[PDB]
Symmetry: D4
Subunit: 182 residues, 8 copies
């Protein structure tokens, strides 16, 4: 099954900075999928991590702690350290950020559907109330808990721009349609 | 026609940082002029890019997206990503920045004439209304749409200083007069 | 007595950035204990320095001068320079920071007991009044003079998180209990 | 099963340079074992790669091509490129080096047994004749095909030294005995 | 005509080191073809430069002067400097190396045909006698003037290996057949 | 006259960062004194430049333009660029900074006397009114035009601290008294 | 006793590269003398280490293993690894190099006396026969076991040059005479 | 007299690597000429130093000690260290290299005349016999004592090539004729 290369893989290495590429390869292999086979899930993991990093970059100095991109065990270690210091309740599943100005965890989703339908899926997949949720699509829409978008207009806007240019650079190498599906 | 060297070329490499030098060589070759022949247009492209970079540096954190200095195709890709996210109308010609605090594209001109006369030329060359315009000269004048200079006094002042010192370092190697013409 | 290695030493090098590791080795050897023998005091010195650095990082631009992590003689040199410039009285023992927004020295303690009991010990060990005191524990509590925590909620919170994750990474290699004792 | 840490893991990160550490994590995850669980196999993979690198470093300029430390697919890609250029027959299993001065592939083994018994196992595991074999132990013995040790006394000697010091640094953290077993 | 991307371009950036990539973009634009359109000629220019660099790397200390990868004018400048110092006759067309141990220029060709047929084409395209010629193919054959291969078996062998692995990494992304043609 | 070394020179290289050391050697040689002979004037030039750099670092983003540490000709070039852009009058002698928030040049003096007596000397040496003046001593005093200290308490305080620690590190190598004189 | 500075210390930091400076501070503190008090022994330790490094640099590729400059425990670890691999007998005291071309340990002395008298002292201080001995002085003499100088004329000559220039740079800061004594 | 720029200065910074540029500025200022006025002597000093560096690079490992490019005092310090170690007689004037394989100092001249006439001038300017002499011109000729060219054909050939290309890059900016004169 494992091939020598692939269009999607070449594009993923061309399009994203090498650091988030290694981090995505690692997140995937830690859960048992091969980056070079499930290449659409590879592109998805890279986009998700890049969005998480821009989001953490969008705030004040050290407003966020980054939970995504670490190994699961260290991830949970930091989750426990945050809970047993703030007092917030240990969530059921791993968030992507903790947000100290507003004292809450954040799940970040990136979707090729309607912000409504993923938000439905992930909101009742969480069903933990406390943890905030924030969705972007490849079209430029977002959707957040209590319509509380956590960041400023300009940063969220930079995330939307980046998602749209990624979609255009998948459409140029007719990889967009295969990617949309899933 | 292509020579081994040239005074203007030596001065351009001495005077500007290497990165914007490579970017200018590339902008020029992409449109079919040789940096080592049209050397005055070389110095012009380097000055224009440096001003664009100082301008983008003049604002808050990531207030600007830089459109100039990219390849035309990627340039247009980012323009489409910005339009299809903000809602602003896709301009007719490539701007130099997008400005998210104020939600608009910016053309930056640098002129060896009167800010009035270039502003006339470029304003009705654009004739797109929406896109903002901002002119500096090698004398220290500026002119902007709605007299809205977008940045603070101090940054614009730093751009004027740099333009004047460039003009002095062209006058020392009697390259200024040839440059003025065109 | 001096061994070839040790679990605590391997963990200290794995867990802390190399710079504060060298600084801690140096603080210890300057007072006559071998990092590779007194390994619990090694981990303590590394934690204390890391907390001092995060604390100095928590403020505005250059709000703090770092006194800890220098050699004792240079340390006292900077203490004299601060006193003979501000006017504040030369403390009896070396603080960890000077804090210019609030014009005072700061001792930072890190404890595996109750903030109350260490605060007692160090507060009457100081008995200099003027110098501020600030304690963190490996549980997430703090205690400060005049309940004046000097920094913002978010930064202190980041220090508590880091202390708790250090405690978890000592508990995973059953080194926590030995460490607690002392 | 997956823990927060481990003595063997801390030692492996302390003892080997980070590059071969990442390469070993990757070789292991590519075949489905978790570096943080099978920690003895982790230390084994790191030792094996370091020996392969010193071996390739032992020769003239670019005498060797390194086959070990690449992904399996690229590994086989380079094997095919070597075969279809030299004329040597495509081996049944992946070697560790190709050796151009002597025109042959090399398997490198590192053993905690007798060079005789591993050499038996790996020699009839290969049973390909053409590919050379070269074994080192943690005691300082080696064994090679046709008693042709490929390198000079001094380099092989440096590999033996390094293996013995690794064994001493496992014995100091009483990890040696567990490691020996397997 | 100019697109947003392309499979061949993504592969060329994935497969070659960035430096020779920039150099190839520049060689091409200097003669008026766009790297992003004529992508097969892009891959060809990158392969040719990489082979030239490995060739220059194959000799003693500073045995070669590299003529390829410079701008045409500087290229000719170095050719004149070599002629007017050694005494060898100024060739009609730009070589790829000068070779000081053997006092002669070298053209290096890389072909997807028979070394015989390209050697015919380039040998009577040169028809300058003095300048040496050296051809490699993507199959592992070479052909040189006076059967004088200039380098040692091992280095030429490394060039053949690299060419074959490039051919395999074009065949994996079914770009090989399009590339062969031309 | 020129010696092989000197205590003051060794101390100057130990005490200051190499960049300002090279800049001071250059300022001195440009006016015809040898850093290795007039070593007290060497230490003075290094202290003066370091204070100028901390001062420029004390403000907002790019609030200052640094005039000191450049060659005299480029220095005057930047002075002309600032005048012919702001409108402020071209001073008689080279200042150390331009200050754009407050639109004025700044002379910075560092004295081993009373801020009053140097301020007298330099204020009527300037006698240009427009240019601001700012004096520090090695004791911790300052004195500024219109008692307008331009910066915040904390930054000026950091400059005083640094001056006092320099004085202590000259007193330790009994170089202070020789230095005081002059 | 511990001072703020010292002429010898400033000279030692000016004269030697920072790496061997840190290594010497560490060798000294490991045996209980303070670099800033016993400053002559500081200069001696730095000279000795620099000579050891030039010596190891004087041979082929990896002809030497460096024993000096490591911590005593790791030092002995490498000594055991060398003995239990080569077969040579474990010396009584720590050498400075192992020399694999000639299969023996080397003590390197650097003396301000006659090569004869130190050679006497260190040769019967060793009284281990097997370990080679090699002395240099600050005058340009050497003395070795079996008159076997291990290296080539040119390298030993470079070590003599460096020792003499160190002696001249101590004589310029009248530190030579104090240094000679001891 | 001191100007803002100059064609020759721009060319010197374009043509030579920055390190030898700083070294030449320093050699010149140490003897009292301003690099920006005597620009032809600037280009001469840069060419001379570059040739000295290529010459030292032409030999084995550390065959040469570089005397040129240091300050005069350190220069003489190294000359004394070499004499008082080898036994060769202290020359009257500063050479450019010492050459340990052949145990002698080397003056390197670079001339725009006949190797005969400079060799005459410098040979009886030296009149020290012992010190070797080696001249190159901008045409490709050399001349050495006892026709002993010290290096191999290939390296000297690389120095001739570089001199000729420098001459061509001065002729392109019609600076060659002014340079020739003097
Ligand atoms: C592929 O790796 C995993 C990870 C997990 C657990 C952790 N998952 C995430 O962190 C996560 N996974 C997503 C996905 C990509 C699922 N969709 N998207 C997020 O936004 C996200 O935060 C489960 C299954 N596979
Ligand atoms: C030389 O490159 C081009 C580019 C174009 C299209 C894009 N032009 C620009 O981006 C642009 N061109 C300018 C000029 C230098 C034209 N004047 N000045 C700007 O300020 C500017 O933004 C057309 C013709 N030649
Ligand atoms: C180990 O080094 C020293 C240093 C000293 C003097 C200076 N001590 C400190 O700076 C200091 N020492 C602590 C300790 C670790 C004591 N507990 N904790 C602080 O928070 C702290 O600031 C005395 C004895 N040993
Ligand atoms: C753990 O990774 C693998 C790899 C393979 C296939 C490739 N194996 C090797 O390259 C290899 N594996 C060894 C081992 C560590 C097996 N023993 N030792 C070598 O010296 C060696 O070269 C099979 C099973 N597991
Ligand atoms: C694309 O750039 C050029 C360059 C030239 C002139 C110089 N050409 C070369 O240097 C050159 N061109 C080749 C080609 C790729 C032609 N085939 N192959 C070599 O091996 C080679 O050395 C002419 C036309 N196009
Ligand atoms: C040593 O170099 C010079 C420079 C000059 C002209 C420029 N001088 C300065 O820039 C200057 N010189 C000072 C001094 C050190 C004079 N005192 N102190 C400043 O604060 C200062 O700004 C004149 C004479 N010698
Ligand atoms: C200062 O450190 C030590 C080290 C030791 C044991 C190890 N000594 C050495 O390695 C050593 N010590 C020397 C000296 C400087 C002693 N003379 N000189 C060598 O050439 C040398 O190799 C004993 C006492 N003090
Ligand atoms: C410009 O600097 C100096 C240096 C000196 C003394 C040292 N001179 C040299 O080192 C030297 N000077 C040359 C020159 C450039 C003189 N011709 N050429 C060499 O090849 C050379 O080695 C005397 C006068 N001016
Ligand atoms: Mn997640
Ligand atoms: Mn998520
Ligand atoms: Mn533009
Ligand atoms: Mn523009
Ligand atoms: Mn402290
Ligand atoms: Mn403390
Ligand atoms: Mn293998
Ligand atoms: Mn193997
Ligand atoms: Mn070519
Ligand atoms: Mn070619
Ligand atoms: Mn000044
Ligand atoms: Mn001043
Ligand atoms: Mn020793
Ligand atoms: Mn020794
Ligand atoms: Mn010279
Ligand atoms: Mn010379």
């Amino acid at each position: 099954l494992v091939p020598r290369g692939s269009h999607m893989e070449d594009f993923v290495r061309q399009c994203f900075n090498p650091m988030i590429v290694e981090l995505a390869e690692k997140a995937m292999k830690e859960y048992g999928e091969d980056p070079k086979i499930e290449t659409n899930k590879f592109a998805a993991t890279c986009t998700h991590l890049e969005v998480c990093f821009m989001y953490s970059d969008g705030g004040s100095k050290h407003r966020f702690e980054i939970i995504e991109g670490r190994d699961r065990i260290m991830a949970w270690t930091v989750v426990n350290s945050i809970c047993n210091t703030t007092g917030v309740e240990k969530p059921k599943f791993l968030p992507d950020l903790y947000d100290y100005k507003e004292n809450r965890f954040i799940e970040i989703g990136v979707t090729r559907r309607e912000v409504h339908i993923y938000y439905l899926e992930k909101a009742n997949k969480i069903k933990s109330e406390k943890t905030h949720i924030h969705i972007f699509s490849f079209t430029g829409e977002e959707m957040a808990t209590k319509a509380d978008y956590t960041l400023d207009e300009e940063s969220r806007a930079r995330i939307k721009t980046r998602l749209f240019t990624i979609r255009q650079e998948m459409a140029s190498r007719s990889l967009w349609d295969s990617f949309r599906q899933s």
